[PDB]
Amino acid sequence: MTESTLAFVFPGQGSQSLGMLAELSELHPQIRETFAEASEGAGVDLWALSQGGPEEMLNRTEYTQPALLAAGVAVWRLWTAQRGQRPALLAGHSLGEYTALVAAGVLSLHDGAHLVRLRGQFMQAAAPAGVGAMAAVLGAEDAVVLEVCAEAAGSQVVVPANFNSPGQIVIGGDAAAVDRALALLAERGVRKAVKLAVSVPSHTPLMRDAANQLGEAMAGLSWHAPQIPVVQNVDARVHDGSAAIRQALVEQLYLPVQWTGCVQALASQGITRIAECGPGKVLSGLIKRIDKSLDARPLATPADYAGALDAWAH
């Protein structure tokens, strides 16, 4: 049943695309039914939005979140149904963490979808138009980005928001503070740093109150014991029991995603194989930079899926 060297990871914001899973859904009627079930909790038709648009709504986080959770759980159910090996550990990036919890049996898909729709709304409302920004900084040292953020802040907020791989940090916060940080890094030679299209400043102190709203939303739902442990982003550790798992999710929102740490924690626990379970191949790319010995494969397309099943079915 469970294969001890195998982990599944679940992508988050940035990984959606118009038509995601189109080609797998043509082969597997379960995919759309999974989207319909997610759609009931989310209150939007996630399949119609993600296949037909409008892309502008798809890219808006209260919609991207439940669509990506539906997508990740659709690929999970397909893999499970087709008797692929069961992973020993799960993790997911930001939103992906909720997908991992749905896969572990902690939340029903319906609740998960309702929950991340709400999470998206709470995060969007925490920073209205032009208030926030996020920027990917490529090739610098953690220490320097962290000291540069402290220098640029002033009275505003700018902080590391994703630790994604060595030489990839996302910073975010107040738009003017993010801009000052980039100017400071540019002055220091870094210069490979781009503003991201989604402006919501996730994983900074501007999400602090939105996290209290999230915690209260969580506390009305049933949480079940996980069937596979989930390595969580706030601290790259598995948490025991409902209260601790919800607490790590409240803290996730306003503190940085420790992606490098989550992946290193998996490797430390005997994981040598990783399936990216949902659309795109973002996490696979990051994994390749964190630890080049890990065998990372995406599952979001018919050829990738079939390639992974052939190599890892039990």
Side-chain angles (χ1 to χ4, degrees), residues 22 30 38 52 72 92 96 102 112 115-116 129-130 136 154 160 165 170 193 286 293 305 307:
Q30 173 264 124
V102 180
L115 191 53
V116 300
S165 79
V170 185
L286 299 179
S293 73
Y305 177 89

Side-chain angles (χ1 to χ4, degrees), residues 15 19 102 107 117 153 155 158 203 205 229 269:
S15 279
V102 180
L107 286 180
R117 175 107 197 248
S155 289
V158 52
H203 312 294
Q269 283 170 240

Side-chain angles (χ1 to χ4, degrees), residues 133 149 152-159 172-178 180 201 204-207:
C149 282
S155 289
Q156 301 184 118
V157 168
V158 52
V159 295
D174 293 294
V178 170
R180 292 187 307 261
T204 71
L206 309 175
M207 296 294 108

Side-chain angles (χ1 to χ4, degrees), residues 8-9 21 24 75-76 78-79 274-281 284 297-309 312:
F8 273 47
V9 305
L21 308 195
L24 274 173
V75 179
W76 172 255
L78 172 67
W79 175 271
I274 304 171
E276 177 168 16
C277 182
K281 65 197 213 294
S284 294
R297 314 184 190 222
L299 312 174
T301 65
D304 293 340
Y305 177 89
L309 247 204
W312 312 331

Side-chain angles (χ1 to χ4, degrees), residues 66-200:
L68 282 177
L69 183 140
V73 177
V75 179
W76 172 255
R77 282 165 174 199
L78 172 67
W79 175 271
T80 294
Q82 295 209 148
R83 310 221 81 214
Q85 295 165 6
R86 272 172 199 279
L89 288 170
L90 315 164
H93 189 289
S94 180
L95 178 280
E97 185 158 309
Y98 286 79
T99 318
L101 291 158
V102 180
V106 180
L107 286 180
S108 73
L109 199 200
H110 171 99
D111 291 346
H114 149 86
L115 191 53
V116 300
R117 175 107 197 248
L118 289 178
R119 172 170 182 281
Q121 297 195 152
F122 297 150
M123 302 167 67
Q124 198 71 54
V131 163
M134 306 275 275
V137 178
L138 300 319
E141 302 177 299
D142 279 355
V144 172
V145 181
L146 277 52
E147 101 174 64
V148 167
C149 282
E151 269 177 54
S155 289
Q156 301 184 118
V157 168
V158 52
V159 295
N162 289 1
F163 294 100
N164 286 152
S165 79
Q168 298 164 118
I169 285 185
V170 185
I171 64 170
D174 293 294
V178 170
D179 282 347
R180 292 187 307 261
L182 296 181
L184 283 172
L185 297 156
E187 178 83 291
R188 291 167 84 117
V190 185
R191 284 175 212 275
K192 314 104 72 41
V194 61
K195 258 191 275 150
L196 310 176
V198 180
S199 64
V200 185

